[PDB]
C-alpha cells in the first residue's frame, strides 16, 4: 500500500470510463520520481465490484514479472481507491495506430512479437488473459509494447488448463475463441485466438473487429468457418498466422510458444 503524500495527481484527465478516471501523475521512489498512470475509482470507490476487480487486478499484477506486461507500482488508499502503474506514455495501441497511419509493417510486427512474448511468459505462468485486446497493449515508445488491463484475468488452478466461467457475463465476444463462447471455458490457446484478433486490429491501424455485426451474428460466421478477409496491405505472412490463432478446434490451435516464434524477424530453430 502506498503513501498519499508521495503521489501527485495531474489536475487534468488521461482518459475517462464507466469506473471513475485515469489520471497520470508522479510518485516518489527510493531517489527518483516516477511517472505513473492511476486509475482511480468513482464515487469513493462505492460500486463493491468496481473495487472487487481493482483488488483482484492488484493481486494479479503483484505475481507478474516480464518486460512486456506493465509493472504495478501499487494500490493507494486516500480520497478513492487508486491503482498506481508505471506510466507507458503513447498509450493504447488501437489509438496510436488510428492516429499514426504510416507505421511501418516491420514496426507492427516487432509490437505483436513483444505481445506474444509477454503472452509466452502469461501461458508459461498459467494465468489467462481474458481481454487481449489492441487497446489493452499500452505502448512504452514506438518501439516497446507492453500488456495492460488485468481486470478479467485468472491464475489457473493446478489441476486444469482452463478457467470455467459460471456462464456467460459481460464479455469482449469479438474477442473471444469458440470454446469461451460455447462452453464458457478460458485457456491460454483462448488467449492465441484473440491475440489473432489484436493482430487484425494492429495491421487495419485500429480498426475494430467485425464491424456491424452482433455478438451471435460473429459466432454463427465462426461456425460456418468463415474468418475476417486480410487488411490492406498486411504482409500475407501476418494474414496465414491470424488464421492459424483462428483455428476452430481448441487442441489444433498454436499455444503462444509457437506464435511467439512465428513472429520472430530473425534465423531460429524451434
Ligand atoms: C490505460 C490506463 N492504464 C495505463 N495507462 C498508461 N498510459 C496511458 C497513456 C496515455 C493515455 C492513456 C493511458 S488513456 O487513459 O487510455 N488515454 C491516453 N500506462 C500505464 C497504464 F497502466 C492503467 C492504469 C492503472 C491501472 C490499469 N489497468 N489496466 C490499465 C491501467
Given at each position: 500500500?502506498l503513501?498519499?503524500?508521495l503521489l501527485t495527481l495531474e489536475?487534468k484527465?488521461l ?7 485515469v489520471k497520470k501523475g508522479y510518485y516518489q521512489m527510493?531517489?527518483v520520481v516516477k511517472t505513473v498512470a492511476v ?31 506493465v509493472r504495478m507500482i ?10 498506481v502503474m508505471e506510466m507507458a506514455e503513447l498509450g ?46 499500452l505502448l512504452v515508445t514506438?518501439?516497446?509494447?507492453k ?124
Amino acid at each position: 500500500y502506498l503513501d498519499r503524500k508521495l503521489l501527485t495527481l495531474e489536475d487534468k484527465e488521461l482518459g475517462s470510463g464507466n469506473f471513475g478516471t485515469v489520471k497520470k501523475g508522479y510518485y516518489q521512489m527510493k531517489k527518483v520520481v516516477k511517472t505513473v498512470a492511476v486509475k482511480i475509482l468513482k464515487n469513493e470507490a462505492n460500486d463493491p465490484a468496481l473495487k472487487d476487480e481493482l483488488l483482484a487486478e492488484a493481486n494479479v499484477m503483484q505475481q507478474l514479472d516480464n518486460p512486456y506486461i506493465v509493472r504495478m507500482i501499487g494500490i493507494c488508499e486516500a480520497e478513492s481507491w487508486m491503482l498506481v502503474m508505471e506510466m507507458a506514455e503513447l498509450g493504447p495501441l488501437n489509438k496510436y495506430l488510428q492516429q499514426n497511419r504510416h507505421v511501418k509493417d516491420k514496426n507492427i510486427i516487432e509490437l505483436v512479437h513483444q505481445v506474444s512474448m509477454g503472452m509466452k511468459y502469461l501461458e508459461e505462468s498459467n494465468f489467462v488473459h481474458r481481454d487481449l485486446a489492441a487497446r489493452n497493449v499500452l505502448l512504452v515508445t514506438q518501439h516497446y509494447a507492453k500488456i495492460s488491463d488485468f481486470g478479467l484475468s485468472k491464475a489457473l488452478r493446478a489441476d486444469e488448463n482452463y478457467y470455467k466461467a459460471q456462464t456467460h457475463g459481460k464479455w469482449p465476444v469479438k474477442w473471444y475463441a469458440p470454446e469461451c463462447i460455447n462452453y464458457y471455458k478460458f485457456s491460454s490457446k483462448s488467449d492465441v485466438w484473440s491475440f489473432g484478433v489484436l493482430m487484425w486490429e494492429a495491421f487495419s491501424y485500429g480498426q475494430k473487429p467485425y464491424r456491424g455485426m452482433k455478438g451471435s451474428e460473429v459466432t454463427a460466421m465462426l461456425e460456418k468457418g468463415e474468418r475476417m478477409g486480410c487488411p490492406a496491405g498486411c504482409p500475407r505472412e501476418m494474414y496465414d498466422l491470424m488464421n492459424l490463432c483462428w483455428t476452430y478446434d481448441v487442441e489444433n490451435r498454436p499455444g503462444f510458444a509457437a506464435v511467439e516464434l512465428r513472429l520472430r524477424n530473425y534465423y531460429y530453430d524451434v
